[PDB]
Amino acid sequence: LIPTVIEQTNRGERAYDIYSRLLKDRIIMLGSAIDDNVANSIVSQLLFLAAEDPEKEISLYINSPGGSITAGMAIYDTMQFIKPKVSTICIGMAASMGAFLLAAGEKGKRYALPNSEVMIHQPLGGAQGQATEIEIAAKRILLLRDKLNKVLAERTGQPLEVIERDTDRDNFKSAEEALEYGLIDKILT
Amino acid sequence: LIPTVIEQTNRGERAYDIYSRLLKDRIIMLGSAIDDNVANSIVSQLLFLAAEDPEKEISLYINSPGGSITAGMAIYDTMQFIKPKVSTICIGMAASMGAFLLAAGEKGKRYALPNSEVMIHQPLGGAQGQATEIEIAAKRILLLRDKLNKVLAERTGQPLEVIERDTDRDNFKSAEEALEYGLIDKILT
């Protein structure tokens, strides 16, 4: 039931949906749980936008209760490959992997609204079979655990032995505590 | 089965749905339970409307049985960021979070029909795990409880120790009792 809109450039009467009128202003929304179908669309939006004008800013407008691990890195790498600069904004919530992207923005452009929340925790998982199939999964998941905490340390500023200890659990944060922890740079008013 | 409408500006014969003909007159409807998909559309309607003419009034036309907590604050902050003025009207019902927005309108523009209802109660929740995962959830939910009651006190006028006591429960109100409690300013005739 998302409405339609009418727009008139020179000829006039061209009718869009409301999510495609923002993409004409270089905005991308992310308002769902991250799966593999959602990431293939975001990856294709960024590359389309970086082809018309390769020197123009982009925005991302996060609000998500997390999701997969692979799909998030598929976006973290595409944001670093392209030439333009990306900026990130939190709206309401930023869970498991949304917070790995909110900190991945450009240094100096990472905003947030006054009453928001930020959560960080270590990965979940699962395993089943016989004794040789478990020693493998338990060896993969720890390498992921040690890969993410090496990125957060350089993005935020904190040392590594603090990130290994702080998470361990579900750890909620407001918009003012995060400004000191190092996840963001400014608050909007 | 919501009908269509025909409109003729200069050329004529442009056919809208009925919900997109109101948005051309700066009106927004909210007639569902608040989730994360509904809020991302309302947040995108307000910003589109505040770009053509940044000095023109907006309306919101509430009727909802409540919903989430995060999505409601995602709208309460967007209403305060923009330049124009927003006005709120109750139609039939205004439950848990609809009443947090009905009071968030501009001082002097908060209307209601003669036979309406207004309800206010404290948050619900849930928790499960071991003894260390419960001490965290029970610490988060109380901060939310103490955050909302600090906003209602300044919007209405009442002191804080009255808001802590009054709710405690489901508390229904009519359109004339609320005019004294302080949630609204006028009744339509």
Binding site: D25, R26, I27, E57, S59, S87, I89, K109, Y111, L188 | L47, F81
Partner: peptide, 6 residues
């Protein structure tokens, strides 16, 4: 959300 994102 401008000034300044856009």
């Amino acid at each position: 959300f401008s000034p300044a994102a856009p």
